[PDB]
């Protein structure tokens, strides 16, 4: 909230996963083989150090999660009240990451501007999207996606 502790801010929150947890509706093993291997690029994260390179990768991941769960479809699929708590948490992390950047902490200055890594995360979400479209946004399709993002996002965190 003022980047005064940068180690905090380059991690993903625990509250995020917690909210995603509560959002569940149908079971997880209810959706049998109605699931893809979405090929998340874990390479892009969790490296113990060099969480300097990471800030923008976590920034776009969250912007992505937000955009995915901000559609008319997401609004249909999930509880109104949890989604509002979810956006607040997501908003917080962006606000926090952006804080560090605006005060010269974790400012990307490399030739690629970490774009290759961004594109990676992006392709990962274009597939998530393509999946929900292909599966006519079924309850299962969504539950797979919810569990997937939760797994995915956990790599960005302390766990």
């Amino acid at each position, epitope marked *: *909230t003022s980047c005064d502790l940068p180690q905090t801010h380059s991690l993903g929150s625990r509250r995020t996963l917690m909210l995603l947890a509560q959002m569940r509706k149908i079971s997880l093993f209810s959706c049998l083989k109605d699931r893809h291997d979405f090929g998340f690029p874990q390479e892009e994260f969790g490296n113990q150090f060099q969480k300097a390179e990471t800030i923008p990768v976590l920034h776009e991941m969250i912007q992505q999660i937000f955009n995915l769960f901000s559609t008319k479809d997401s609004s249909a699929a999930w509880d109104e009240t949890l989604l509002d708590k979810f956006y607040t948490e997501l908003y917080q992390q962006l606000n926090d990451l952006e804080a560090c950047v605006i005060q010269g902490v974790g400012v990307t200055e490399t030739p690629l501007m970490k774009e290759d890594s961004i594109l990676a995360v992006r392709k990962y979400f274009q597939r998530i999207t393509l999946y929900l479209k292909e599966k006519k946004y079924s309850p299962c399709a969504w539950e797979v996606v919810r569990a997937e993002i939760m797994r995915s996002f956990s790599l960005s965190t302390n766990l």
Partner: antibody
Amino acid sequence: QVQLVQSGAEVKKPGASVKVSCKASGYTFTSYSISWVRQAPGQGLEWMGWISVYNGNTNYAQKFQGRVTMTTDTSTSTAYLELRSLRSDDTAVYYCARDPIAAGYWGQGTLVTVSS
Amino acid sequence: EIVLTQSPGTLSLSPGERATLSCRASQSVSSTYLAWYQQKPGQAPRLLIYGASSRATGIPDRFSGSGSGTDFTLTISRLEPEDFAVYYCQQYGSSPRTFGQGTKVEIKR
């Protein structure tokens, strides 16, 4: 609904100051930082600076460094912008905008008119 | 300082046509820190697109965004009358946040 509602229009002489204000509602005031974008008549947006509502940290555009102070009041969930030694070309609509950018939250804007 | 130069200054298209706004940074910006706004007379800016592609809530499907390095583009697939407005890009990955000087999209008739 989140909303940022700012103070009324101002008219000042040069060398004076303005303390435009911007009141937040629909969310916890301290949890998100706020910045000020300014727009002279018939011209683009111009980012002035940024304040951690929570911790009171500030960043400023060099243009205004040491002539503007941004502050906040947690009890009244109001962010202020003070602008000192005003010039004719501070004539502009001043906006308060809330982080993060994705949030899309802005205020209606306060018009300050500096002139002799 | 990272100077965003928008182009064209004024785009003149008739409704149904395709807009292509350009934004160009004096140096590279991570696509994650680029946004687009739409402003109409007597109104605050309004976020269209964040992180370079992502549509804000309420922003319709006809709006898309792309770009990386120094070049970025907003595309309005099928211009409605609603849409004729001034459009700004913004970078926000660095010290002074900066905006493009804006493109007026005005109705051609």
